[PDB]
């Protein structure tokens, strides 16, 4: 035990050069892939707006071409999934988690074209889904493809290169280098068994893909919020209360997403016809709502800066939240290709702002700004539903750049994770994998 | 597969008892760190008061500089050799051992020894950090509450020991994230998996950071302002800086170890020659902390000055060499106090130096040496202790220049790569390995 430890200590932080060089090429590819994907979604959302201008006169005809375009593109995505790669439904992060435990296959020859071109359909149609789902799974498969193509041998190389791709995938989705790396070593990292995931190698992958992202998406931030006010020590207890509120809601949102997966499965019964058709009905509803109330539909990044500044009324915040809860469930729970990670930022922001508004008028002596509660709440749902607070915190921090709010951000987040545990909730990425694995043995 | 479904659904479930105890650990570690911080300042203040009362006679003032620092150093060195030998040097390697169940945590001894012992070495003006003391002290605080409350299990033993070590680093820098990251990057038994609960570590760090801000608000340890950005066509220069840190990283690791040896011959383990030599070094610090304050002291003072580009080229090379020398004489001679902080000051200075050369070599890039200072700051931490992700987030938390995250990562990564390929080893692991190998020798 002691003799062996001296051997281990002196051998620590030694990753074979072959793995390192390969980690670089993984990130490089994942970056370009994510960039190309990002351009596609924009290009398609652009075309949809072009068609609405060509029919800007006839109101019912305008509402028709909103629905149809979104339906046609959704159906295209839903089809590409059920026909070629079933594993590429929903997020795909739980699928990568399985692959790390050697419990799921990585069929890159299938998923890469299916998740890519399939995502372009669902995201480009205006559905309430994130890019992370697609980019993380895509990124992992890119890491497997280069393992296969270059025929690399070992448990280290199989897990490490699969991980760096998943990280560079999240990194390139948010321009968040650290959030990518932390997400792996907090959520993924086989959470019960020690692994051979080399941290140094994950880093390189993330760097390359972040650079790739900046080559094409420089001079513009995804979220601009400006520098907000500070938070006095005598206001911290208000952030802990915000955590508790997220702490009870966290698991409840997790029940709904799962339950809704079930309720939507009855509608089609596994039938590729009823599924693709229902998928288009939901997709069409989003392109419709992304016109009559754009805040209810779409990714959600657009309404974050607006919400933080306090430009919405109280009534409008409650409306947005309820409608966005509904639309988030209908898109993700119906197995569409696309993550739930980003929509959860938008929900936390909105809920946080709402709490801030109440807080502002209840305590003028504190000199509050609802915006700080928006930024505290942003990564709070991520802490109470995915149970990766340290990832959520650093993600928000990397995207909003308000370090002076690190304490409220931590406290709210920790508050969320505590009450999420004590009300019997479970990490949503783990529960979706466990349901897939339990249903895999439920027909044997 | 069946076992995995059982694991997945049981993940992130930490017994409430451990959580509530995590809170109390951090609370204690915070106050302790604060009290420790006040003491060091209090004593540095006294030393300056005595220099005023003899500000006339030049050799007389140089004497009371030496003596005060010698007397306080001796007090620290003695308190270590007499009561707790394990509390020499940093103490982070000692806590790493304790996590692998390979070293004992004698809190009844170390708490008073490291505390009052550190107050002597740090308060005397020696080139050592607060982390060493605070992390070790923090861990023992986590052991003390395990013992006093009689908590049972491998989880409770490792978790509460960890949160204290993290809350210890957090309260040393006002760096909550750097504390947590450092545990789950450096410490976390690097070869077998453990029961260290991440959620529990958080709570401890929160409470101790709150404790730090209750007494040390409205002032940051380092202010540097918002620096300029870094264009994509300039990133290759940060990679080169990493390479230079990558070759030097392991070589600085050689000297620290070699110097532990060279200084052991001087006293041979003798509590008289040790304490006396300890005072000679300690006295040299209080002397240099007057005739050239940059060469002595913790180092946080000269960081803001260096980043702004207020030093000349000659002055930067001088400070570096002198600061290399004084960093080794203080840490390698087993004095209670970390090497973590002095390494920030070295990296800053080296970074700035590279920046100055870069500025004049490339006017087309519109450079500012200050960005290379902040890139270099956590670079030596990446090349000598080989915890880059911790180093990066530490600097980030202390400088608040997120726009430099790419250069900071690139430089850091560059350092860790070339530190590996020139046969260097994580210094906190090597110091544990040497203590464990000499234990069976």
């Amino acid at each position, epitope marked *: 035990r002691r003799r062996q430890l001296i051997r281990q200590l002196l051998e620590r932080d030694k990753t074979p050069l072959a793995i390192l060089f390969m980690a670089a090429v993984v990130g490089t590819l994942v970056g370009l892939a994510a960039v190309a994907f990002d351009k596609g979604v924009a290009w398609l959302q652009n075309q949809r707006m072009g068609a609405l201008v060509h029919t800007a006169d006839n109101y019912p005809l305008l509402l028709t071409v909103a629905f149809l375009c979104s339906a046609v593109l959704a159906m295209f995505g839903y089809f590409l999934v059920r026909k070629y790669a079933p594993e590429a439904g929903g997020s795909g992060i739980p699928e990568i988690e399985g692959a790390l435990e050697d419990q799921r296959p990585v069929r890159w020859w299938r998923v890469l074209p299916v998740k890519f071109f399939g995502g372009l359909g669902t995201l480009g149609g205006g559905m309430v889904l994130g890019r992370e789902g697609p980019t993380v799974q895509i990124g992992g498969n890119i890491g497997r493809m280069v393992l296969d193509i270059f025929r690399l041998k070992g448990d280290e190389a199989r897990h490490t290169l699969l991980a760096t791709g998943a990280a560079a995938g999240l990194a390139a989705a948010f321009n968040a280098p650290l959030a990518g790396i932390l997400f792996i070593i907090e959520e993924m990292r086989p959470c019960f068994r020690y692994t051979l995931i080399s941290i140094k190698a994950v880093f390189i992958g993330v760097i390359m893909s972040t650079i790739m992202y900046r080559i094409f998406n420089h001079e513009v931030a995804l979220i601009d919020v400006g520098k907000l006010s500070d938070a006095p020590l005598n206001t911290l207890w208000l952030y802990l209360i915000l955590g508790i509120i997220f702490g009870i809601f966290g698991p409840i949102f997790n029940k709904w997403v799962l339950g809704m997966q079930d309720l939507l499965h009855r509608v089609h019964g596994g039938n590729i016809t009823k599924w693709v058709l229902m998928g288009g009905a939901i997709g069409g509803l989003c392109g419709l709502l992304g016109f009559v109330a754009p805040a209810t539909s779409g990714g959600g990044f657009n309404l974050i800066p607006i919400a933080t500044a306090g430009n919405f009324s109280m009534g409008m915040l409650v409306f947005i939240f309820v409608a966005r809860v509904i639309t988030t469930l209908l898109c993700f729970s119906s197995g569409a290709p696309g993550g739930i990670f980003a929509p959860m930022l938008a929900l936390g922001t909105v809920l946080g702002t709402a709490f801030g508004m109440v807080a502002v008028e209840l305590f003028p002596q504190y000199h509050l700004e609802a915006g700080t509660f928006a930024i505290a709440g942003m990564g709070a749902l991520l802490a109470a539903s995915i149970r990766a607070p340290l990832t959520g915190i650093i993600l928000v921090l990397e995207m909003t750049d308000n370090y002076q709010l690190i304490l409220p951000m931590i406290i709210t987040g920790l508050g969320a994770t505590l009450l999420a545990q004590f009300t019997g909730g479970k990490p949503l990425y783990s529960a979706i994998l466990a349901r897939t694995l339990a249903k895999q043995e439920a027909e044997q | 597969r069946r076992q995995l479904i059982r694991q997945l659904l049981e993940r992130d479930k930490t017994p409430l008892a451990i959580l509530f105890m995590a809170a109390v650990v951090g609370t204690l570690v915070g106050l302790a760190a604060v009290a420790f911080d006040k003491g060091v300042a209090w004593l540095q203040n006294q030393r300056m008061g005595a220099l005023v009362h003899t500000a006339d006679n030049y050799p007389l003032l140089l004497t009371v500089a030496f003596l005060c620092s010698a007397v306080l150093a001796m007090f620290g060195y003695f308190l270590v050799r007499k009561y707790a030998p394990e509390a020499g040097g940093s103490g982070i390697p000692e806590i790493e051992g304790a996590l692998e169940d390979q070293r004992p945590v004698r809190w009844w001894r170390v708490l008073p020894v490291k505390f009052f012992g550190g107050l002597g070495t740090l308060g005397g003006g020696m080139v050592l950090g607060r982390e060493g003391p605070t992390v070790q002290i923090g861990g023992n605080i986590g052991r003390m509450v395990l013992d006093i409350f009689r908590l049972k299990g491998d989880e409770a033993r490792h978790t509460l020991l960890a949160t204290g070590a993290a809350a210890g680093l957090a309260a040393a820098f006002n760096a909550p994230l750097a504390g947590i990251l450092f545990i789950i990057e450096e410490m976390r038994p690097c070869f077998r998996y453990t029961l260290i609960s991440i959620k529990a570590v958080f709570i401890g760090v929160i409470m101790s950071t709150i404790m730090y801000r209750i007494f040390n608000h409205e002032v940051a340890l380092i202010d540097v302002g918002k620096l300029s950005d870094a*264009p*994509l066509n300039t990133l290759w220069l940060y990679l080169i800086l990493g390479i230079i840190f990558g070759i030097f990283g392991p070589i600085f690791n050689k000297w620290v170890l070699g110097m532990q040896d060279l200084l052991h011959r001087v006293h041979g383990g003798n509590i008289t020659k040790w304490v006396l030599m300890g005072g000679a070094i300690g006295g040299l610090c209080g002397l240099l902390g007057f005739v050239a304050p940059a060469t002595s002291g913790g180092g946080f003072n000269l960081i803001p000055i260096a980043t702004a580009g207020n030093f000349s080229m000659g002055m930067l090379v001088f400070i570096f060499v002198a600061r290399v020398i004084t960093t080794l004489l203080c840490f390698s001679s087993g004095a209670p106090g970390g090497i973590f902080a002095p390494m920030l000051a070295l990296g800053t200075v080296l970074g700035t130096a590279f920046g100055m050369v870069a*500025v004049e070599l490339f006017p*087309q890039y*519109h450079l*500012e040496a200050g960005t290379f200072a902040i890139a270099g700051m956590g670079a030596l931490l990446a090349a000598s202790i080989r915890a880059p992700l911790t180093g990066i987030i530490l600097v980030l938390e202390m400088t608040d220049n997120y726009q430099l995250i790419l250069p900071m990562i690139i430089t850091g990564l560059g350092a860790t790569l070339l530190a590996q390929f020139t046969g260097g080893k994580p210094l906190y692991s090597a110091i544990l390995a040497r203590t464990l190998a000499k234990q069976e020798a």
Partner: antibody
């Protein structure tokens, strides 16, 4: 965002004048600022540049204190003093804000210009 | 200091024509910028880093080239394009401007 430069007009040969450029609409203490000139009917010629913290000031190959560039972040103004003026300095002086894409710096936003006539 | 030379000093074209003017350098330049200066107006940053368009610049414009030759191209030129176009580099120091290419319209 607007750059409004002023202080031009008539100056004697051998004399000196101080040009100002008042800036507004952007965080002025964040950008490098520059001066470019254009003689009547001719092309553009870079004069100088100055970083926000006034520590770096590069000029075109000129004499001693031919040009002197300074900035006052409190007033949001860029200054240019020209010494020992000869007819080659009879031009239109643009005050420009500097920036980059990949890193190869360009003249982002230009002012309207002030004219200087060196005549008797 | 690198000397930029712009091929046609003055050129005439009728709207609808494809138009190309050239910026040639004495040494080796990378990522050059173009400025438009219409009559009695200040130069406006038009094309940057060789081929990127500034916001508001119509898609009819395009830049390219590398090494010692760079070009600005108007695909189907339009009458509103009557201006003098200056190229500029800052890959070396000091940065330097071209001579100008005055575009005139045939109507």
């Amino acid at each position: 965002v607007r750059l409004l430069e002023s202080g031009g007009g008539l100056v004697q040969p051998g004399g000196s004048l101080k040009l100002s450029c008042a800036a507004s609409g952007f965080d002025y203490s964040r950008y490098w600022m520059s001066w470019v000139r254009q003689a009547p009917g001719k092309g553009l010629k870079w004069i100088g540049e100055i970083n926000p913290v006034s520590s770096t000031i590069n000029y075109t190959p000129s004499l001693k204190d031919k040009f002197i560039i300074s900035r006052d972040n409190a007033k949001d103004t860029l200054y240019l003093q020209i010494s020992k003026v000869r007819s080659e300095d009879t031009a239109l002086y643009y005050c420009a804000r500097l920036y980059y894409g990949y890193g190869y710096w360009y003249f982002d936003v230009w002012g309207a210009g002030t004219t200087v006539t060196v005549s008797s | 200091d690198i000397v930029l030379t712009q091929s046609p000093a003055i050129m005439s074209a009728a709207p609808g024509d494809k138009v190309t003017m050239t910026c040639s350098a004495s040494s080796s330049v990378s990522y050059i910028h173009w400025y438009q200066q219409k009559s009695g107006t200040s130069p406006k940053r038009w094309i940057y880093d060789t081929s990127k368009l500034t916001s508001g610049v119509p898609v009819r414009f395009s830049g390219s080239g590398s090494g010692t030759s760079y070009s600005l191209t108007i695909n189907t030129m339009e009458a509103e394009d009557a201006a003098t176009y200056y190229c500029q580099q800052w890959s070396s120091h000091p940065q330097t401007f071209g001579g100008g290419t005055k575009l005139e319209i045939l109507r």
